[PDB]
Structure formats: structure tokens, C-alpha cells
Structure 1
């Protein structure tokens, strides 16, 4: 709040043949008589300095949030929508992709990678791996140095079983009890590639309901 305004900086008046903008007081310095207190002056105060009262967060209706999540889930099951979103699903056996729950017992990232190759999500994983690169602006000067694509999202019934899958680059992990729309439709684009465990698949009817139930 004090930025640009921490000077005496009175206006010289109108008798002198200079503009009427406030000028820095004193002498013996290069800054003496320099224009101050203005968005146009060097070292001055910006127009409408930014505040922390700006509305950063938003309220969304609970039913609208649930509708959005339901629509993203419905769109994730259409192979053409998943294809058009960017994912490489040309070799996967079926959409929606449901696998057995034995993957929750994996302890090695190489077992996880073997399972991914077996179910043919390795194409999308390789897509994101090849897509990794350096960001294209000041974001990399901030803490956003690297970017990559999304890749498949593996959904588990509970919090267990992610040990072998946490370190795979390009694979996201999800819990069926807490499904995020920011991950079901990245960028606002519906049609994410989702790999369901069997238990997570069977929980879907009770989690989201039915048109009648």
C-alpha cells in the first residue's frame, strides 16, 4: 500500500514552466524534482493498486457440480470423445476399460508398467512421456518449469494399492469415492481416458445413483 507513495512529492505549482504533477522534494540528487505520485511517472504508483479483497474463489451449486461430474463420466465412456480429446486408445480392449483388482497388490513399478503394457495404456503413457518439455514463458521462471500431457487416469476403490503406480510419469491416480472434475475433464475438455478397477466400477451405481434410484 505504501509503494510509489513513500515521498513528500508536492506539486511545484503553475508559475514555473513545468507540468503540475507532484515532484520529489529536496536537492543534491538525481531524483530531486522528478515527477512522482502518478501511474505515468517513473517510480510512481500504479493505477488502481491491486488488493487482496479481489474475489479469488467462487461458489458453485452442489447439484451443478454433481451434474458436471456426471457429464464428464458419461463422456469418458465414448471412444470417439476420448479420441478427440487427445488420448491414444487405439489398442485398448474396451471402453470403459475395467480391469481386475489384483493390481492393488503390486509392490513394484515394473509390475505396474507390465500391467500398463498388457492393457495397452502404454501408448498414452508414452505420449505424455514424449510430450514432456520446458514451459514457454515466465512460468518456468516461476515454479512451473516443465509441462506434459495428461495420460490415463487409474481409479481405485480405496486409498490402497498406489505404491507401484505413484512413480509412473504420465499416469494419474484417482479414488472412486472422491472423483475430481478438474481431472475428469482437464482444461474443460470432456473425454478423459479412465481405467477402472472392478470394485470401483461396481461402486459407481451406489455413488452416483440411477435415473430412478
Structure 2
């Protein structure tokens, strides 16, 4: 809230042949007499400084949220819609792809990786692996360094 306004910074008036903008008081410094407090002044306050009580979050009708999930599920059973989203499902046996319950007994990633090859889900997994790269732009400076595609979603009956 105080950024760009931490100065005395009074305007000089009209008699002196300068623009009527607040100027930093004092002397003996390169900043003395410099423009201040303005969104157009170097070191000044930005126009309409951002606040934390912006509306960050949204309400969605409970029925409308369930409608969206229902529509997304129905779309996942259409092979042409899955292909149009970018998934490599050209070798999977059936859509929707249903597999037996025994995968929940796996303990080693080696077993799970073998299962993904049997049902031909490994092609979409491989599409994700080849797409890993450094993110373009400023986001890599933040904690968003790497990007990749989505890949298949495996749905289990519980948290086991």
C-alpha cells in the first residue's frame, strides 16, 4: 500500500517553468526535485494499485458442476472426441477401456509399466514423455519450469 508514495513530494507550483507534479524535497541527491507520486513518474505509484480483496474465487451452481462432469464423462466414451483431444488411442482394445481389478495388487513400477503396454495405453504415455521441455517465457523463472501433455487417466475404485 505504501509503494511509490514514501516521500514528502510536494508540487512546486506554476511560477517555476516546470510541470505541476509533486517533486521530491531536499537536496544533495540526484532524486531531489525529481517527479514523484505519479503513475507516469519514475519511482512513483502505479495506477490503481492491486489489492488482495479482488474476486479471486467463483461460485458455481452445484447442479451445473454435476452437469459438466456428466458431459465430460459422456465425451470420454466417444473415440473420435478422444482422438480430437490429442490422445493416441489407436491401439487400445475398446472405449471405454475397462480392465480387471487385479492391477491394484501391483507393487513394482515394472509390473504397472508392463500392464500399460498390454492394453496399449503406453502410446499416450510415450506422447507425454516426448513432450517434456522447458516452459517458454517467464513461468520457467517461477516454479513452473517443465511442461508436458496430460496422458491417460487411470480411475480406481478407492484410494488403494
Per the normalisation by structure 2, the TM-score is: 0.99
CA displacement, residues 147-201 of structure 1 (integer Å, 9 cap, x when unaligned): 0000000000000xxxxxxxxxxxxxxxxxxxxxxxxxxxxxxxxxxxxxxxxxx
Shift of 1:79: 0.1
**Following TM superposition, where does structure 1 have runs of at least 4 consecutive aligned residues deviating by more than 2 angstroms?**
none
- Tell which structure's C-alpha radius of gyration is larger: 2
Shift of 1:108: 0.4
Shift of 1:14: 0.5
Quick one: distance in 2 between partners of 1:2 and 1:48? 13
Quick one: distance in 1 between partners of 2:50 and 2:116? 48
SS in 1 for 2:136: coil
Shift of 1:128: 0.3
Name structure 1 gaps, 5 residues minimum: 160-212
Q: How many residues align?
A: 160
Q: CA RMSD in A?
A: 2.3
Where relative contact order (Cα < 8 A, 6+ residues apart) is larger, the structure is 1
> Is the aligned partner of 1:31 residue 2:31?
yes
Name structure 2 gaps, 5 residues minimum: none
Shift of 1:4: 0.2
Instruction: Please identify which structure carries the higher strand content.
Output: 1
CA displacement, residues 6-52 of structure 1 (integer Å, 9 cap, x when unaligned): 00000001000000000000000000000001100000000000000
